[PDB]
Amino acid sequence: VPKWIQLNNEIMIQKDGKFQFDKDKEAVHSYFVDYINQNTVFFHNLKEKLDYLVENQYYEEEFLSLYSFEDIKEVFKTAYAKKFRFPSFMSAFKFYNDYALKTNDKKKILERYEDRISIVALFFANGDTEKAKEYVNLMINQEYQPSTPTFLNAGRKRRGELVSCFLLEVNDSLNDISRAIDISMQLSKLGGGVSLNLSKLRAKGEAIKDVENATKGVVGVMKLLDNAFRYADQMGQRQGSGAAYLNIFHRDINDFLDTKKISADEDVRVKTLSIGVVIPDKFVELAREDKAAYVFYPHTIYKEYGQHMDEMDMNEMYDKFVDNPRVKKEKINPRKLLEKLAMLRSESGYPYIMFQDNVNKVHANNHISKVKFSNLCSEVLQASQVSSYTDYDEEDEIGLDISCNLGSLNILNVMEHKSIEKTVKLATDSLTHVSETTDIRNAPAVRRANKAMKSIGLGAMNLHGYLAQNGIAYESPEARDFANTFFMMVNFYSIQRSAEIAKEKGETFDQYEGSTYATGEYFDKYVSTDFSPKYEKIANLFEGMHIPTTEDWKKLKAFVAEHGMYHSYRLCIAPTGSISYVQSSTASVMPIMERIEERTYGNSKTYYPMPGLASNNWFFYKEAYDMDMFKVVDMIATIQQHIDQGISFTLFLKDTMTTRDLNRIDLYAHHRGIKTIYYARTK
Amino acid sequence: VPKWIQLNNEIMIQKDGKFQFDKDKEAVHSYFVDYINQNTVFFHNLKEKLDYLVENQYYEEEFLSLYSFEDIKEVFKTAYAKKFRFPSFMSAFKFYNDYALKTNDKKKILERYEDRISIVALFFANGDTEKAKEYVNLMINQEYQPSTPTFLNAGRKRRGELVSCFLLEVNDSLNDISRAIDISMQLSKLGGGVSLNLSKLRAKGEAIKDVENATKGVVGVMKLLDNAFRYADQMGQRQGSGAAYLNIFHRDINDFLDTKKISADEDVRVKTLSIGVVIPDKFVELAREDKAAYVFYPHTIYKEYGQHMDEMDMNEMYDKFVDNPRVKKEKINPRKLLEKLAMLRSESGYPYIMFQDNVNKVHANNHISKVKFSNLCSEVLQASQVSSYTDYDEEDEIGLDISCNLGSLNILNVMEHKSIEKTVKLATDSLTHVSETTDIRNAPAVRRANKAMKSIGLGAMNLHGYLAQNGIAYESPEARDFANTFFMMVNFYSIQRSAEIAKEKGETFDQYEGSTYATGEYFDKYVSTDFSPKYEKIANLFEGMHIPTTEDWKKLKAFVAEHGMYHSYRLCIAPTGSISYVQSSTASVMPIMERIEERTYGNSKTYYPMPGLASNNWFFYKEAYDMDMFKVVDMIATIQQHIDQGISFTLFLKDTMTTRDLNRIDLYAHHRGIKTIYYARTK
Amino acid sequence: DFTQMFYNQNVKQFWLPEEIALNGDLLTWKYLGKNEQDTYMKVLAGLTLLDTEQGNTGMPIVAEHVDGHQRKAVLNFMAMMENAVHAKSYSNIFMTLAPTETINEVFEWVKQNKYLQKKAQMIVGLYKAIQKDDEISLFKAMVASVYLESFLFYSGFYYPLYFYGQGKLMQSGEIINLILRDEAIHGVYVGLLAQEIYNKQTEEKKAELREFAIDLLNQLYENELEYTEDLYDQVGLSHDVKKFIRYNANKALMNLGFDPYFEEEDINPIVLNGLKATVEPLKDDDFYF
Amino acid sequence: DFTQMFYNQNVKQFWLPEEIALNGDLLTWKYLGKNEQDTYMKVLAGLTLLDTEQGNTGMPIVAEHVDGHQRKAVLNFMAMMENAVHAKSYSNIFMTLAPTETINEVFEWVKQNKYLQKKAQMIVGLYKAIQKDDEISLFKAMVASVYLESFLFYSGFYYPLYFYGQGKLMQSGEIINLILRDEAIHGVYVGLLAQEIYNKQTEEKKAELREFAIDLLNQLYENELEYTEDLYDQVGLSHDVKKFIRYNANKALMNLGFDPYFEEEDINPIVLNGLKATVEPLKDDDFYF
């Protein structure tokens, strides 16, 4: 066993009844003085390194050609001047195993952390040396972390796409289904997770040109998509991951759910395609009143009204659907469907739950389209227009397929540096650059939506780490007050940066004029309610930083009205799974699953303590499963009120609790304004 | 139990030690006195019937509008003047259960046999009343039978395409694979059987964008195609049928074959995807000499030579591939592979066997392309060019995808009417009309090849029926003499009609000038070898009909040289599954499987004796399983020497014979010039 | 002289209800009156009860007491069919046609129905009275089993057959015909075993055994009449069903080697209408011709 | 939680002896030495004799005492497989390989054999000791049954699997593999029924039942070692067979929800080549906060 492995395992060997957390630090030293420094490839100077990486097809030469070598040297020197040290063994291990650039045979390390950060910063700046240094300082301080696609692939010749998630709308036609399968394979080839809205597809037993009971429903398309994602599995490196979203009022909703039952037959079971359910407020109202609900056949509704079932408001059209004899429907028990959802989530963690009305009551771009589904991580909530892929030799009507670039603020590092504004603006600029340089030649709706919406996702990580390292319980009202203030600041500065980009470029996102940003409605709660901290401890935490007031929000509203906004969507809180290790941060705004996690790598086992875990903050690092899910819902709703897109909200459940407890948590989330629920992980 | 069913089951009841075959005739009468006439919709006049069928979206207005009502009435009167009577119960049952037009509620019969024949004739003639009457006389004499798609769908508004055999070339790309899946779905939606060539696809463990061990091979593509064919199942009417062809020198050939093993796992086995193997002469030579063979990685060959492995002659390329270090290959035992093929055919009848050099040594259009694969029934053998389907908003390079037009001569009815020439020419004209009226807007290469090649398949059936009713054993040399003469006359008149159509329209098929028809090579064996019958009995059978001599063939060769040939391909012998029942004929040129076949429809049993079966010809109606497969191979080769495309050749084996016997039959078929082997049906 | 041929017949008749798709009956079921659906559910529930006890108790207990491994294999196979195939098939039918509450109610109804409880009490009582090495107690239980197989099922079978014969509920009807085909051979087989024991007796003992068989038949018959009226009066068929059960009572007696007891009657013609390969390597001479 | 799932797996594994043609085994049988033929015959007779006890007593006695209609049906199906399928399959293998006189002599020998008798009578003794309405005695019999299905058969299965893995006696080896696959699921199922009883007991009673199971395992294991040497020393395989016995003993214990008794060992590669949260309804007022 390696020396650093033994040093890392020495953490759990208690001395005087206490964990040896400091041993972890020793491990990193070993991991660098025995493996990383020996396995790294050193050159005489930076010129030889850059030339070797360029000619050997490791780096794209275009982004490096925008800078003179003196500027690149200055950027690299700025990166190395911080003398960044990984405080935990797992941070360095995760970076050098998942994100550091290696040779073709993967026998040596070509990129250090500073090298990777410098390359990403130079790609972000697009020829601006000062901007590149700003990005270097932002990432080496670990205030901002680009998503895994962006951080791993920026400036690389053998790179994939920098966009993490893609959302596709599938129209009710064989041509559209085949095009959706093709685009899903193309985007999984690019490495991104693909989500498909199957609510427009007509249910099982519908007519294909006057011959009835002909359609296979959404389950056949689900099987096709599952095989497509199995085939396109990132060249066999990462399993192809897809998501299917169906409205709960679709007739196939049961069969949909039956794809995830552990007793499902092979002709129905789907195993590589995640499932999500979109629940309008009408379904929750029907379940609450115990009135029997009706699921609908989408094609009959489309024939009668000319629009898809998910294209209009069910809260106002459900009674018209039920009373219409030309609309076909089936009777269901909404409470039984809710119990089935809870049982399925207990068994397998599926489906994702999207509260459609919670998303669309604060959605700023309802004029473009209502949000009808979410992404594979159930945090992207954007307007999408379905595409009409016609026959060959016929022009296709290209719609809008959602796609946003992810980037997370490290809350602990951002607040320690007292740089919410600067970090938010620089992250917005980096995400705007990632969107601008993204061009996908096989997904036309994705390309058009990227060019028009200009949507980005700016997330946050290390919420629980910051709260526990500052002596604040994650479930406490003080923690929710901190989240309210911090994310109001993040939203304020993201809107300010979006408006500044719109002013400097003279262009807004497409159809911005009909948005609530243009009409000023979006700023209502910000121009009437003060989001400054209500607790003295939180206010002290925010000292040295100008917390925006109602007057600052009014000025920002006027600025947006004058100049517009460059981005249709700005903030989305992704799960941030593996890149949180490198940043020494807790995953996303979720509470920690465990204080010390035991992970098996190779034939060895390693223990990763939570960042900053110690004796004095052991009980502030409360495990998520031990927490009240209602207070976690309160925290997520408090954050969500300042996030325009959704938050990947994983439910952390105990084995003792029943499906009724899961249903109660889901209904409280819906009541509190939670937009989406990601996972039901049971301990 | 209905009266006609009792009268049909009375056949097996033996009187005086003989089957009551004549009772079947009585059954037909009952089937018409009790059921057909009662459930047949009658109109006051044909005008009312046509108006009702057109208005209720049963027929098409376009083809009926080309004639005055007097001409349509005259065509219907010509059809009804024959007073055609089905000689067996199963003929009428199959027609009125499969082909007769029924109401939307499927309880009444709108079309009789004469009505359907008249409608198909009017569709064929395209406005010529005399030509329509000629077609009516052809089909009511049952000399020619349009295929199930053409016969069932001609003149019907609610219909699939008139072509059901489609051959697709799949290029080695994700875009091409997705396009192939889409086209397969679209053609299965039209009701056609789709065959895909997977030899150009790179094997498992190949590089994608210079990353190693990334390709899933052809088995993942087969899984995708199997899911696509399961999804597209004729609006839930018939099981989606598809075929995949792989060259035996493709490295995936074992895994390909492993998709049909019973022991194969769920992630390996494809259930609704037929498989065929293309066997070049090089593989047979390697197996014969017991030299170990090599299966090659197609992408390495493409990188080294710039052409696909299946696009070049393996006979001259195999040694260069083996000696090339940059071509990756795996060692195999060709005799072990042959034994595996025989074992798989014994277990499941798969794969289909295509002898590439047997096809291509007589292929007339090798300049366009060599025949690389066959159809789902393993009888279509045509030149195909792969298409380069690029990314979106980029122009695709459309190639040639095979789609031939099926139609079968009834050898008994044709020869008893002494009308080989007239029937062949009229069938060629009808096939040309159906090929010209076919327009598929979702298969670009299929449409392009249909417009360019103008390829049709004119088959024959009732060969064994005709031979048995004339006191000739199917395995006798007299039967092969008759087949030689009859199919040489069929080829002569098909070529003459093709040249006449080319002269009339002033156009040939695309790239005809490079064909062996243009150079006169095709006629070589016809201008030197006399194909007149060598037996007096066969000559007396051909009495009253002019048998083309060598001088006639020289005149035809000169005529083709002067005027060209309209069809790239003219003759292919399809299995003729259900139309053989309606025509009261034995299926294809195959020998009969059973003298009397027992079938179960609903909860009732039915008995179909072979047409013309009696005590006198009971011995001549020898069952296929009791026959020597070498003599069946000899007869099929005798026919194949006059057929430009292949013949659906099913092997009929006993359970006693082993895989050595199957391999011997396959090798004798290869030796005798058999182009394709369809199935290995074990009794 | 017969067990081997019964063994072969039983195993070749093997089936599972899942082989028959039932969704095709959905419409003809929907179209029946409430009275008709009620009688149908109850009829099949009565059958389910009989097969439950024939599988759990009757066939296994007779298997235990009958000598010979082949005879035991046949009886064990028949037992499996009763509870693993027949009794279960009824639930397949119920789960297709009826909502859970109607299913729950009909199973509650079997527990409280006095005629169904009486017939179960009588038949199962005789099964449980079998004494080891006592051939007379075994004979009595075999008579009871033949009466269950060849007589008692038929008040139930009438109705699915009556519909099948009119082209209604034909998928459910197909299941029932398969069940009936099995019971016919089960009744013959057990009948032959009963005759073996009867034929060992003195004439005096035989006379007593005939008395037992006829007294038991009459007692079961009188109860079945009341059961039949209770189920069929609401659909107007009680008299017709009664003729059918008398017909089948005679078949049960015949299976036991006894003369028919009831006079022949015309049965509803609708119900009558309701009735790897060896592998050799390739030689170098197989490549030349 | 499990009976319907096992029902499905059992019925979908249904097979018949006639499906495998046996005559082609004579082409490898003729090439075995006398010791190999002798061991094979003796092993085969051992399996046959033990499986007959399971068909005539083991499965039917457990089916009799277990409550639940669905469990009784699954158990009936398993008893059917023993008597109707497995027993005929063993007979077929014998009749193919040996003449009538040789079969009679082998069965005479194995019937008198001390190690075969010891284990056969130990198992049968526990089946005979089951008392009505006593779940402790039922559990003990279930333990015995699991030990037979999942452990005692395997000293015997070793040899056919050993040949099967070498390409010898492939037809009879295929049959044995199908039989073994049935016994595996039988052992798992009966194991779950035993755990159900075990889990209803106090902690002291549990410890007492564990001691019973381990003590029984020890007695059977020590006799298996002697049985093994008696049969396999003459063909030099005993060391490897002993590893296979312990590996299968551990599987039997795991079927009964117990920890493995023996250390993990690798098995002969030739033989290897041969081989829900609680649903609680929404009560309303869960929609209001």
Ligand SMILES: Nc1ncnc2c1ncn2[C@@H]1O[C@H](COP(=O)(O)OP(=O)(O)OP(=O)(O)O)[C@@H](O)[C@H]1O
């Ligand atoms: N935790 C760590 N994170 C990142 N790099 C590290 C870490 N530990 C060691 N290294 C690398 O290994 C080298 C070993 O040097 P070390 O940290 O022991 O101190 P040093 O030799 O006094 O110099 P310096 O600390 O100034 O780099 C470091 O210079 C650095 O490049």
Ligand SMILES: Nc1ncnc2c1ncn2[C@@H]1O[C@H](COP(=O)(O)OP(=O)(O)OP(=O)(O)O)[C@@H](O)[C@H]1O
């Ligand atoms: N074998 C058969 N094949 C086809 N149609 C038949 C057959 N037998 C009877 N029919 C149909 O039933 C009708 C009655 O025919 P039948 O044998 O009674 O005498 P017919 O002289 O042909 O009668 P019609 O006056 O109808 O011409 C026929 O006209 C035809 O439409």
Ligand SMILES: Cc1cn([C@H]2C[C@H](O)[C@@H](COP(=O)(O)OP(=O)(O)OP(=O)(O)O)O2)c(=O)[nH]c1=O
């Ligand atoms: C062709 C086909 C379609 N479908 C379903 C899936 C699609 O969502 C739906 C629409 O198919 P379409 O491609 O729209 O078929 P169509 O346009 O010819 O028919 P229509 O005019 O009614 O739109 O039909 C199947 O389930 N199986 C099939 O094989």
Ligand SMILES: [Mg+2]
């Ligand atoms: Mg459409």
Ligand SMILES: [Mg+2]
């Ligand atoms: Mg390519």
Ligand SMILES: [Mn+2]
């Ligand atoms: Mn029964």
Ligand SMILES: [Mn+2]
């Ligand atoms: Mn019975």
Ligand SMILES: [Mn+2]
């Ligand atoms: Mn057994």
Ligand SMILES: [Mn+2]
């Ligand atoms: Mn067993």
